[PDB]
Design a protein around this motif. Structure first.
Motif, short mmCIF file in Angstrom:
data_model
loop_
_atom_site.label_atom_id
_atom_site.label_comp_id
_atom_site.label_asym_id
_atom_site.label_seq_id
_atom_site.Cartn_x
_atom_site.Cartn_y
_atom_site.Cartn_z
N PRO A 27 0.79 -1.24 0.00
CA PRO A 27 0.00 0.00 0.00
C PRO A 27 0.83 1.29 0.00
CG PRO A 27 0.24 -0.76 2.24
CD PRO A 27 1.07 -1.69 1.38
N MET A 28 2.15 1.17 -0.14
CA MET A 28 3.07 2.31 0.02
C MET A 28 2.82 3.45 -0.97
SD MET A 28 6.65 0.51 1.17
CE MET A 28 7.05 -0.23 -0.40
N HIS A 90 8.63 10.26 9.63
CA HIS A 90 9.21 9.72 10.85
C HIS A 90 9.21 10.70 12.01
CE1 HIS A 90 11.56 6.14 8.90
NE2 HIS A 90 10.28 6.16 8.57
N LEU A 93 5.76 11.02 13.62
CA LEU A 93 5.43 9.87 14.43
C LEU A 93 6.18 9.92 15.76
CD1 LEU A 93 4.10 7.17 15.11
CD2 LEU A 93 5.70 6.12 13.50
N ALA A 113 2.92 1.82 11.83
CA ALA A 113 3.69 0.88 11.01
C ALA A 113 3.89 1.36 9.58
CB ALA A 113 3.04 -0.51 11.01
N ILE A 116 6.28 4.42 9.29
CA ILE A 116 7.68 3.96 9.34
C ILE A 116 8.11 3.38 8.01
CG2 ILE A 116 9.31 2.35 10.42
CD1 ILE A 116 7.16 2.51 12.88
N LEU A 117 7.24 2.57 7.42
CA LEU A 117 7.52 1.83 6.20
C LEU A 117 7.67 2.75 5.00
CD1 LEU A 117 7.42 -1.24 5.07
CD2 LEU A 117 5.03 -0.66 4.51
N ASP A 120 10.76 4.85 5.29
CA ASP A 120 11.92 4.07 4.83
C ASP A 120 12.00 3.95 3.30
OD1 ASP A 120 12.75 3.63 7.41
OD2 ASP A 120 11.88 1.63 7.55
N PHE B 86 18.95 -2.16 10.76
CA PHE B 86 17.94 -1.13 10.49
C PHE B 86 16.60 -1.79 10.21
CE2 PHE B 86 15.35 1.32 7.54
CZ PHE B 86 15.36 0.65 6.32
N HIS B 90 13.18 -1.55 12.84
CA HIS B 90 11.91 -1.09 12.31
C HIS B 90 10.87 -2.19 12.18
CE1 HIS B 90 13.43 2.93 10.41
NE2 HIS B 90 13.76 2.80 11.68
N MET B 94 7.16 -2.33 13.91
CA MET B 94 6.00 -2.49 13.04
C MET B 94 5.19 -3.75 13.38
SD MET B 94 7.18 -1.24 9.22
CE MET B 94 8.94 -1.45 9.18
N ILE B 116 12.85 3.98 15.84
CA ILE B 116 12.74 4.59 14.51
C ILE B 116 14.00 5.36 14.16
CG2 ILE B 116 11.48 6.24 13.05
CD1 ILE B 116 9.06 5.55 15.14
N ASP B 120 16.86 4.53 11.40
CA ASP B 120 17.24 5.48 10.34
C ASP B 120 18.74 5.78 10.30
OD1 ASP B 120 14.62 5.71 9.53
OD2 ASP B 120 14.25 7.57 10.62
N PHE B 123 20.77 2.95 8.73
CA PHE B 123 20.56 2.92 7.29
C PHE B 123 21.34 4.04 6.60
CE2 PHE B 123 17.32 3.34 3.59
CZ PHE B 123 18.13 2.60 2.74
N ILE B 153 12.28 -3.50 2.22
CA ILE B 153 11.13 -2.63 2.50
C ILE B 153 9.89 -3.20 1.80
CG2 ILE B 153 10.16 -0.32 2.17
CD1 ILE B 153 13.29 0.57 2.35
N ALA B 157 6.40 -4.57 3.33
CA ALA B 157 5.10 -4.11 2.81
C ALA B 157 4.20 -5.29 2.49
CB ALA B 157 5.28 -3.22 1.57
N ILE B 160 2.98 -6.85 5.89
CA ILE B 160 1.85 -6.03 6.36
C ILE B 160 0.57 -6.22 5.50
CG2 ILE B 160 1.06 -3.66 6.88
CD1 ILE B 160 4.06 -2.99 7.40
#
Lengths: 338, 338
Positions: A27-28, A90, A93, A113, A116-117, A120, B86, B90, B94, B116, B120, B123, B153, B157, B160
């Protein structure tokens, strides 16, 4: 020609960024679209999104320094905007901010969540947008992006590290604001040029321009956060004081000493534990503003803005550059103050 | 020589990574130290940290393909480990996982915000560790890191996106596991070589080895997550079934059809809404394992492991490489299965 450059940067970078964002795995792509204001909370299209365009305008300008076309700096402008927005997602949040530009933040709408995703994902995409080019210039441009991104993370660490402090020093505020705002403007100011082939010395100098422009910008932002008129800002009266920020005027007032400074210290310490903070009136926030002004907080911050402007514009003098481009860089610097 | 290589990778990369982590701005250096197990929840020193060393061993090996010294791939191994961690920081937040390797996760101890932030920071540091070198090889190596990071990432996704689904297809599980595990092993397998000057074709091939090695590894991990003995795993009996993971055996069993498959479908759908899931016994988790085996889930996943091993090892054949190095790459591939 002032608003012509801001238009120039927005129209060049926005469609490239929008197309890269739509390409993210579900869903990003939709959650990012919500962040960017292209769709609303239930996924239907929306507007009221386009904020300011200083950074993109700067990056396309940066490319012209070497003589290259504005479009050469477009990867640079897109990467800067992406890192910027990763930072927002970020930071919002982390700060527990439920709102940004009067709209619910991603974490409120779509959960922590997904904030954050997508954060990233934008940060990884920024590096991709540059490294995709496969050139030596692109590797060096990513190096500059990384420095700025590590810096923004540092600035946020500083923010968290000071969040319960009753006082923060002027020096601490300056290096935080340099990390938070300066570093990314430094990057935006130098990235197009790096993409157009400029050597390591030309670039650093443009970085020095952008950094000090960033500090001048944040000083003015701090002045507008307190004394700004709702008809120009969009925000409530004394908005930064309602959020208890330790901006430069606040901090400069605290560091001053004298009856205004001492009393402001007692009040802000009291305000932090205050059971009825949610009931505070405009007039109480006005009183605190009035006390910051008496302690010389406002004046000190206007003088800092002016000083930083000068250091920025005087750094431009040091770099060999077409005089039409230098003029354009000079005019953005004046727009930054108001 | 099998455990000699894992030792070789750990001892080369750990001190370089530890030194880079200690250099992070406070509190990020200590919070990261907690993540890495070097200090405990109240900040006093601790041990029980050193997990597996497949990725670092792989990256130093990757450098030897071109003939370069192992140390040339150390930036590559450090960057891979940083991105890996990283991802953990995260992903744990999540997923709401309170524990990892029987120790509280960073978010539980130090708050979501700091998880978080340090995530970051790691990364951004990974990109720095490579780009610091200033070379063309380093830019290309960062390109490979970015692909793998965008992939992880993506995998998250996907995770999730499927978290409420009653069934996930085999194909969906495979591409998720490829993103989650394969992409970073692909990067670890090819990054040292890129740092040692290898062309774009040699590198991709090593990537194909690493990716398919990653899938073989995750298939075996999925077998051990269900049928692994507590004396070898450290985890509880049927640990992945206690966490309701849709691993390859689970998924392959569901896709099968037949009385075992159909009944497992009904049960796992029921288990998701089950008020007394927290009361489930070993025997109930055994029954579900027994049903996955009857539906041919276990067997299918062992055959996938074997198949992927073969595709990996048969990709090594395609690259011109010193035969001592090829032998070393071949032996890691056998270690990955158990």
């Amino acid at each position: 020609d002032v608003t012509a450059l801001l238009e120039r940067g927005r129209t060049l970078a926005t469609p490239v960024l929008r197309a890269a964002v739509d390409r993210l795995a579900p869903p990003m792509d939709t959650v990012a679209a919500y962040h960017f204001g292209w769709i609303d909370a239930q996924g239907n299209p929306a507007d009221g999104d386009g904020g300011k365009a200083v950074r993109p305008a700067l990056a396309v300008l940066s490319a012209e320094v070497t003589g290259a076309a504005p479009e050469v700096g477009v990867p640079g402008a897109v990467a800067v905007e992406l890192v910027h927005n990763f930072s927002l997602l970020h930071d919002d949040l982390m700060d527990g901010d439920e709102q940004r530009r009067h709209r619910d933040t991603v974490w409120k709408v779509h959960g922590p969540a997904q904030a954050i995703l997508v954060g990233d994902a934008l940060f990884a995409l920024a590096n991709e947008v540059l490294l995709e080019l496969g050139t030596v210039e692109a590797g060096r441009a990513t190096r500059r992006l990384t420095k700025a991104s590590r810096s923004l993370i540092d600035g946020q660490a500083q923010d968290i590290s000071y969040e319960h402090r009753d006082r923060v020093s002027v020096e601490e505020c300056l290096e935080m604001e340099g990390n938070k705002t300066g570093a990314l403007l430094a990057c935006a100011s130098s990235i197009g040029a790096v993409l157009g082939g400029a050597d390591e010395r030309t670039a650093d100098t443009l970085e020095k321009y952008g950094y000090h422009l960033g500090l001048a910008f944040q000083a003015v932002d701090d002045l507008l956060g307190i004394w700004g008129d709702p008809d120009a800002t969009g925000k409530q009266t004394w908005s930064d004081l309602r959020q208890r920020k330790k901006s430069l005027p606040v901090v400069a007032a605290l560091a001053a000493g004298g009856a205004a400074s001492e009393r402001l210290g007692e009040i802000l310490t009291a305000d932090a534990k205050a059971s009825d903070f949610a009931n505070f009136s405009e007039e109480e926030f006005a009183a605190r503003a009035a006390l910051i002004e008496e302690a010389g907080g406002r004046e000190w911050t206007a003088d800092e803005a002016r000083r930083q402007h000068t250091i920025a514009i005087e750094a431009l003098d040091a770099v060999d550059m077409p005089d039409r481009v230098r003029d354009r860089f000079t005019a953005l610097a004046d727009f930054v103050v108001v």
